[PDB]
Design brief:
The chain is of the alpha/beta class. The chain has a single domain, classed as Rossmann fold (3-Layer(aba) Sandwich), CATH 3.40.50.1820. Strand 3, helix 2 and strand 4 form a beta-alpha-beta unit. Helix content is 39%, strand content 19%. The longest helix is centred in the middle third of the chain and has 15 residues. The protein has eleven helices and eleven strands. Helix 2 packs parallel to helix 11. Strands 1, 2, 3, 4, 5, 6, 7, 10 and 11 form a nine-stranded mixed β-sheet that branches. A two-stranded parallel ribbon has the order 8-9. The structure holds sodium ion (2 copies). It comes from Bacillus subtilis (strain 168). It is an enzyme of class 3 (hydrolase). Belongs to the AB hydrolase superfamily.
Length: 285
């Protein structure tokens, strides 16, 4: 609608921050046309990027130049969230999420890929590497939306109030923390995203979907290299407990808690995150 136009306009603004050339297009999936922003050398290994809830692929601007030197990066807009992907059938269960991603891989012509993701996209990645390990090279999970530990009860109050601008600002103020401000373009886009009343693109809890805490049983079964990163100031849960749990259960995991950052780790400490991910991704033998 009218709000939808304002959101699409804000998204296009945010994309002026993209530091390199890229190709935007849609791929077909059984859950709808999924928006991709692709960058980097066309013969380089594949890297799928999954944004946090409400942020869209635009949030990768301070990481994309570093990662697209050595990888063909595909920044994927999670279908059913506020972004350019266009939902058909609602994506509802954790099985659906992995099927959606298989279709994305398929439409992109990819047998395997590296994946890196924040928050919601981080939780997609854990779900994907569990259900489709054969399609995953190396996996990077940053500030995951649950997955390793339960949210603070608070999280649901903030989520429930995402019904207009006031709610979005309140969410942003809380999630960023007192030490970090979003770039004004991203601030605007996220607010306009929430203002846009579109239920098909509104994130909501579903029966056998997200949010989800993976069981000891599931986590012990992980068979791919995982890099797990939390910020010391993570507002959404006790990152120490998530760290301890992941470290104990996941075979060969590299897990860490980064100083002077909260939830939005790839945005707050891009210099560190950029290189840490490059180092991990090129760590395969
Ligand atoms: Na802030
Ligand atoms: Na915390």
């Amino acid at each position: 609608v009218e709000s939808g136009l304002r959101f699409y306009q804000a998204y296009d603004q945010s994309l002026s921050l993209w530091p390199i050339e890229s190709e935007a297009f849609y791929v077909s999936t059984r859950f709808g046309k999924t928006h991709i922003i692709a960058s980097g050398p066309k013969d380089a290994p594949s890297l799928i990027l999954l944004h946090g809830g409400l942020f869209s692929s635009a949030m990768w601007y301070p990481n994309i130049a570093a990662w697209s030197s050595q990888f063909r990066t595909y920044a994927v807009d999670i279908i059913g969230d506020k972004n350019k992907s266009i939902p058909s059938a609602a994506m509802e269960t954790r099985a659906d999420f992995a099927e959606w991603m298989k279709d994305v891989f398929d439409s992109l012509g990819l047998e395997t890929a590296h994946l890196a993701g924040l928050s919601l996209g981080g939780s997609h990645i854990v779900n994907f590497l569990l259900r489709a390990p054969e399609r995953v090279e190396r996996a990077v999970v940053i500030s995951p939306a649950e997955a390793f530990i339960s949210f603070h009860p608070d999280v649901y109050k903030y989520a429930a109030e995402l019904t207009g601008a006031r709610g979005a600002e309140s969410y942003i103020k809380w999630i960023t923390g007192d030490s970090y401000d979003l770039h004004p373009l991203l601030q605007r886009q996220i607010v306009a995203g929430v203002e846009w009343q579109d239920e098909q693109r509104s994130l909501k809890p579903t029966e056998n979907g997200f949010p989800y805490v993976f069981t000891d049983q599931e986590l012990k079964s992980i068979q791919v290299p995982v890099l797990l990163m939390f910020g010391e100031h993570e507002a959404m849960y006790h990152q120490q407990m998530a760290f301890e749990r992941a470290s104990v259960l996941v075979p060969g995991i590299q897990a860490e808690i980064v100083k002077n950052a909260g939830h939005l780790l790839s945005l707050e400490q891009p210099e560190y995150v950029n290189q840490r991910v490059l180092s991990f991704l090129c760590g395969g033998i």
